[PDB]
Amino acid sequence: SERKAINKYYPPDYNPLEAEKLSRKMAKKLKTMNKSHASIRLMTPFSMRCLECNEYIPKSRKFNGKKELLKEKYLDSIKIYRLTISCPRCANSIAFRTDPGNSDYVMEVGGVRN
Amino acid sequence: EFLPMDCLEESCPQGRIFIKFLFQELVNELGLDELQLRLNSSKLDGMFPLEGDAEHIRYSINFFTAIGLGLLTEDMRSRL
Amino acid sequence: DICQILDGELDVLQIESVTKETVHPRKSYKMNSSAADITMESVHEWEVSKPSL
Amino acid sequence: TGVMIGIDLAYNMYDAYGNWFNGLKPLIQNSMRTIMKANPALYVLRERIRKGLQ
Amino acid sequence: LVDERTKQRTAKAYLKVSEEEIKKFDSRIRGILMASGSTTFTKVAAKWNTSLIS
């Protein structure tokens, strides 16, 4: 019952491998886990303007974003991500990408950096 | 703490310097004249041999001179 | 691995059959109790030693 | 009558105890040694440990 | 203490870390301890060493 709980109770018949298999079988059917744009909490490094309503969301402002994987990676084996945000006033989907060549981000049809 | 009991031409490289060092230490601790007196009090034939022994004490005297000390001259005078 | 080894050296040690028992999955990590993992039938009668290392 | 093979995963020590018949024991020992040198699972475990420790 | 003329160890001088210095040390230790709920054990240890060495 307590966040540092050592052992979760299992039923008396719990073939772990079998259980895993079952879960897998019922993971394609599952709504969540079988989808993109999984949530995340992030502060905004770019400090940018929301292109619709010009709301000047500043640096380090916290948002409940959606992180999604971009299939087209950078180079070969180092992934890059789309990080969706909403502007506070108008609900326009701002987002950005993390191209690690410059050790920084790229704006993605959301707003503009300034 | 210890009793001054000490067993000392041929025997003079490292050993001689060690002896010198010891003497210096003694001087530092005691006080020159006092130290000398103390030495005299013990039998002490090795550090200061009293008998002249045909210019064998000359070496000892020289050694003593090398590290600032007294009584050597007196000893020398005594023997002639 | 043990089973494989047994299979490899069946007739050398006079082994009829090497049965890997269908234990309960957690038997690996039941430290209180235990169970025979690899039961081992003989062809002729084995003359075993006392419990030793 | 039987044997209890035992492998200390955190020290990589192994030992077994129980009943034996003629010619078995050396072979068993050899097998154990082989396993310790290279079992896949054990190797994996070792790797994991290394990773943890860096 | 030595007389420079005669080279005699003519006096003694006993030492003790003044209470103020002790207090300072204690304060330093406290500081090291305080503001260290996170810190990598090693960092803390290093700090302690530094203090102690000083």
Added chain:
Amino acid sequence: CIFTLNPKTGHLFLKIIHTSVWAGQKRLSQLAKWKTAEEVSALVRSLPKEEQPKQIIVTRKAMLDPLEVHMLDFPNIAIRPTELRLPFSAAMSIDKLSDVVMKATEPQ
């Protein structure tokens, strides 16, 4: 098969893996790698100190670690990777070898 070729003398130490090895098994590829490593080790053991290798070269990338593990007894023998996608996967394309592989009732 386990194609083990000495490029100096042309000695192909071909271990024929039998179908009875894979009976009632899982995580099969991994197992196979381990088996291969074991075989290699055995081969090394068999070879005397004069005839033993220096660089055991491996074709694939992920045949290194198991081999290394198995070859801790022989630290003098280095295990080498390669950029070359070498064509020893066409050992079964050779006829006689293929035939031999087919006609095996044991590990050989």
Added chain:
Amino acid sequence: SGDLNLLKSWNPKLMKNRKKVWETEQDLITEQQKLNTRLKEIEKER
């Protein structure tokens, strides 16, 4: 605390990620160099 993003995997400004990227570049770069030289040699031959 201040900047949250610093405790995220995806953040590229995180140092680990940067290191990884560098490693990737370094390996790839090396490969390119190896190939580049070969290419140059070929050109020369031609």
Added chain:
RNA sequence: UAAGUGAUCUAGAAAG
């Protein structure tokens, strides 16, 4: 002629 006997704190769980 006589050294060398004994004094031994602790000790984890939750939430924040």
Added chain:
RNA sequence: GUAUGUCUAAAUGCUCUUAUUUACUAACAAAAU
């Protein structure tokens, strides 16, 4: 300290991949020789 709130009428088995993690959480804490 892993926030939160509104919203609710009464195909089957199969196997194969792993020396990893699109991992998530930051309420917690922050210095040198």
